[PDB]
Amino acid sequence: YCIDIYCRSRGVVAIRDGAYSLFDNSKLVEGFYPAPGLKTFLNMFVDS
Amino acid sequence: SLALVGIDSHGKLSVLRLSPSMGHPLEVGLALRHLLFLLEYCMVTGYDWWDILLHVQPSMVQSLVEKLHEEYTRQTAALQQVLSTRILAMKASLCKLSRVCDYHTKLFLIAISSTLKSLLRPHFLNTPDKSPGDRLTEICTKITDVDIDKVMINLKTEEFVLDMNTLQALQQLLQWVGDFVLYLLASLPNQGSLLRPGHSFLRDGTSLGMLRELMVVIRIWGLLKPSCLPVYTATSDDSMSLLFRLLTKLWICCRDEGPASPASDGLVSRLQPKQPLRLQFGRAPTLPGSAATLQLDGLARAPGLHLGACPTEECKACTRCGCVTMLKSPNRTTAVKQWEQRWIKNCLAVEGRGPDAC
Amino acid sequence: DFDPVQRYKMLIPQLKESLQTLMKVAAQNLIQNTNIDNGQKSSDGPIQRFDKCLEEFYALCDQLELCLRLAHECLSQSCDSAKHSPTLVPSLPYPQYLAVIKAQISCAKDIHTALLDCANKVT
Amino acid sequence: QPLLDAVLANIRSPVFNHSLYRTFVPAMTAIHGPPITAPVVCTRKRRLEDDERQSIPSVLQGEVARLDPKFLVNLDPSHCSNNGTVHLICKLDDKDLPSVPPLELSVPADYPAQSPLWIDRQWQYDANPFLQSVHRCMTSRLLQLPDKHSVTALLNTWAQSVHQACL
């Protein structure tokens, strides 16, 4: 369940999935179990 | 334009600027009238323009430029078909200094894509038919929204090849229009950004149909030769189909006073793994001497095609340009000589078409 | 039930061959575009976009790094425990072990409190 | 081992090396997302103006300024304005008999410069036999110095000989 969170802006950060590798639903990373549950909802709760 | 040069009897002194105020009293209406008159004179005579210091702050310029465009379009009467480029260059030059740089870059991109398309349209060495090839291709506007695969063969497919040695435009210049339409697509459902037009809006409709014609002709090219301009990101070997469908959707939804940046927005809000970036958006700096003082030295300036035109390292003569170009001087190619030939002379308002070493 | 070190050993050839294939497909794409831009219609062979291979290489590197870090943490913990705790795994009972652990934790907390009081008195 | 990619990239030696952009920068933008490449205020200004315009070569004066107080340096009529840049007169002040001062006209920092030339050698050194023998000993000592340095070596050997003159 590799979380991909980091910052690149001067005053902000960004979070995203790290197990898609330019493949939404076409292919996977062929490794550890990806996409655990629903992380986008957890992010959007604490979005504000 | 009353702006003299400081070469008076004072020794080795550099130039200077003076106020172009035509007389003591003020007359805003008469002033803007005189300005529009002299600008139209410069346009019809095709000379250079430096009424920058003369014109009022860009607040009136908007009213000025819209009134000017209205008068030009109405009372052309027909010379518009040959003065369009001139008037667009005038528009760009005037809106450059101001804020309204968005419409400036929009005008640049519109001009360049229009020039490219107008050049590519009669550039087909096809076989004769009932009507002209360009005239027959023009009617593509009168076609259905989706399923291009039908209308493309319904109009014509065979007579589109010109020569075997034509596979130089896809990898070099055709990427421009593809990246452009993709940037337009991705930036559409983002009206919530802190800019009402965002980057651009392009709600003309006609230009959208023109780009649609460009996409259908490059699609028939790809059918004629598999090395076309793909999305360059993923699933390159049927994205073009859905791209065409979405752009036709926006076209129909925006031609006759349509909506703008609701289900359409929701569905285009989906961004497949195909988004490219790093587009040129050619432009150049300027002299933002607003009202009081801006002094420059002779050295150590103070801060204020599609084959690259902005690389990391320099590798050629690096010919400079004013409008958008910033391209190579000899162009280092073999058979793209059409572009080079059409751009041999001064480019679009290419008074700043200079060169620079290093 | 796979051990970390043996997994790393058995996985080294994977990273090697993946880097090799990566270089191969990179050279393929390079010669393709090099024959396209200036040559003729010769390179008609759709290879991998070179994105998947690079991403896989990075992922394998990251997994190997994770396994190595886990092994290192485990061995360091075993080492420090062995070095700062006698052998008592039932000549001392487990409650005695827990009591010793709690006493050491309390002593560390007392040392921390003493140092904090010293820093406070310093200010 | 990975040699095919190396030689294949080496084939594209001529000026038309630009497609590397389209081949690599998409993947780079995918993996790396750095906005910080060169956003800070920066401009290339290699050279504007560099010249002394105020004095002699700094190295010579800087080195001779740290010598002993036993010596005293000044300037003659300015006949070495630009190239020579030095026309010095030195008078040994110590527990010994003084003598005629040297010329001290140096050359560029390569220093193959026997700076003093003894313009007044003949009469001022034939005046007395003592200082004549002093001069002779000096000259015999000078030639053994390989690539002597007027700044330090010459004056040092001269002072040494002048202090040994008492035998």
Neighbours of B302 (CB within 10 A): 9
Q: Which residues contact B307 (CB under 8 A, 6 or more apart)?
A: B172, B173, B327, B328, D18
Q: Smallest Cα–Cα separation from B49: which of B58, B57, B40?
A: B40
Across the interface, do D43 and B303 touch by the CB < 8 Å criterion?
yes
Identity of the amino acid at B173: L
3-class DSSP assignment, residue A4: strand
Asked if B271 has any chain A CB less than 8 Å from its own CB, the reply is: no
Strands A3-6 and A14-17: antiparallel
- Residues paired with residue D73 on neighbouring β-strands, in sequence order: D90
Return the exposure string of C31-66: e unless at least 16 CB atoms fall within 10 Å of the residue's CB, then b.
Answer: bbbbebbeeeeebeeeeebbbbbbbbbebbeebbee
Question: Measured between alpha carbons, how far apart are the two ends of chain B, in Å?
Answer: 35
* A24 touching chain B per CB within 8 A: yes
CB atoms closer than 10 angstroms to residue B211: 19
**Rounded Cα–Cα distance for residues B62 and B57 (Å):** 10
Backbone angles phi, psi at D75, to 5 degrees: -130, 145
Q: Which of A11, A29, A5 is nearest to A19 (CA)?
A: A29
Tokens representing B120 are 């590519």
Geometric angle at alpha carbon B130, from B126 and B135, rounded to 5°: 65
Contact C32, C47 (CB under 8 A): yes
Is C36 close to B164, i.e. CB distance below 8 A?
no
Asked whether B24 and B6 are in contact (CB, 8 A), the reply is: no
Element (H, E) at D87: none
State the amino acid at position B286 in one-letter form: T
Sign of CA dihedral B235, B236, B241, B247: positive
Structure token pair of residue B208 = 């959208």
The residue whose two tokens read 């009469």 is: D123
Residue whose token pair is 């690096």 = B318
- Residue identified by tokens 């600008």 is B39
The answer to whether the CB of D78 falls within 8 A of the CB of D87 is yes
Query: Using the beta-carbon criterion (under 8 Å), do B278 and D25 form an inter-chain contact?
Result: yes
Query: What does DSSP say about strands D73-75 and D88-90: parallel, antiparallel, or unpaired?
Result: antiparallel
Q: Check A32 against C55: CB less than 8 A apart.
A: no
> From chain D, which residues contact A within 8 Å (Cβ)?
30, 33-36
Neighbours of C29 (CB within 10 A): 19
What is the identity of the amino acid at C101?
I
Angle at C6 between CA C4 and CA C10, to 5 degrees: 115
- Tokens 């330019």 label which residue? A22
- Are the Cβ atoms of D29 and B278 closer than 8 angstroms? yes
| C-alpha distance across the termini of chain A, in Å | 24
Instruction: Look up residue D142 and give its two tokens.
Output: 């000078």
Closest CA to B68 of B86, B82, B53, B54: B86
Alpha carbon of residue B62 to chain centroid: 19
Residues of C in contact with D26 (CB under 8 A): 51
**Chain D CB within 8 Å of residue B332 CB:** yes
| Site of tokens 């080294």 | C12
- Who's near B211: CB < 8 A, 6+ residues apart? B113, B117, B177, B180, B181, B247
Sign of the alpha-carbon torsion through B113, B117, B119, B123? positive
How far apart are alpha carbons D23 and B245 in whole angstroms? 29
Residue B227 touches chain D, beta carbons under 8 Å: no
Dist. CA D105–CA D81, nearest whole Å: 11
Structure tokens at B16: 């200077």
Query: Does C38 contact chain D (CB < 8 Å)?
Result: yes
Torsions phi, psi of B313, nearest 5? Answer: -105, 150
Closest among B109, B282, B270, B102 to B186, alpha carbons compared: B270
User: HSE-up of D17 (CA within 13 Å, CB side)?
Assistant: 12
Hey, are the CB atoms on A8 and D33 less than 8 Å from each other?
Answer: yes
A1 touches B: beta carbon within 8 Å? no
Q: D164 with D141: CB under 8 angstroms? A: no
Look at the block and give the residue holding tokens 């009022």.
B56
A46 membership: H or E segment, kind and range:
none
Minimal CA–CA distance to B277: which of C72, D32, D126? Answer: D32
CB of B277 within 8 Å of a chain D CB? The answer is: yes
Which residues is chain D interrupted after (C–N above 2.5 Å)?
A: none
Q: How far is CA C36 from CA B108, D13, D26, in A?
A: 30, 16, 18
Closest-CA distance of chain B to residue A23, Å: 7
> D4, C30: Cβ pair inside 8 Å?
no
Cβ-based contacts of C38 with chain B (< 8 Å): 334
| ω into D65 cis (within 30 of 0) | no
How close, in Å, is residue C48 to chain A by CA atoms? 13
Give the separation between CA B287 and CA B303, rounded to whole angstroms. Answer: 11
List the end-to-end C-alpha distance of chain C, in Å, as a whole number.
55
Give the residue from B155, B157, B160, B163 showing the smallest Cα distance to B127: B160
Instruction: Give me the amino acid identity at D52.
Output: E
Owner of token pair 């007579």: B159
Q: In angstroms, rounded to a whole number, what is the distance separating the alpha carbons of residues C40 and B167?
A: 8
Any idea how long chain C is? 123
Distance of alpha carbon B279 from its chain centroid, rounded?
Answer: 13
Question: What distance in Å separates the CA atoms of residue B140 and residue B155, rounded to the nearest whole number?
Answer: 8
The amino acid occupying position C62 is D
CA distance B78 to B81: 6
Q: How many CB atoms lie within 10 A of CB B349?
A: 19
Is residue B328 within 8 A of residue B317, CB to CB? The reply is yes
Q: Are C1 and C26 in contact (CB under 8 A)?
A: no
Q: Are B167 and C41 a contacting pair at CB < 8 A?
A: yes
Q: How many CA atoms lie within 13 A of D56 on its CB side?
A: 21
Inter-residue contact D134 to D50 (CB < 8 Å): no
Distance CA C65, CA C69 (A): 6
C48, two tokens: 């991998």
**B127-165: burial string, b at 16+ Cβ within 10 Å, e else:** eeeeeebeeebeebeebeeeebeeebeeebeeebeeeee
Residues 6+ apart with CB under 8 A from C66: none
- What is the C-alpha separation between B241 and B149, in angstroms, rounded? 9
Dihedral sign (CA B241, B246, B252, B254) = negative
Interacting residues of B12 by C-beta distance below 8 A, sequence separation 6+: none
Tell me the DSSP string of B187-236.
HTT-TTSSSSS-S-----SHHHHHHHHHHHHHHHHHHH-S-----SSS--
Whether D9 contacts chain C with CB within 8 A: yes
Q: Is any Cβ of chain D less than 8 angstroms from the Cβ of B232? A: yes
D79: left (phi over 0), alpha (psi -120 to 50) or beta: alpha
Beta strands, E only, chain D: 73-75, 88-90
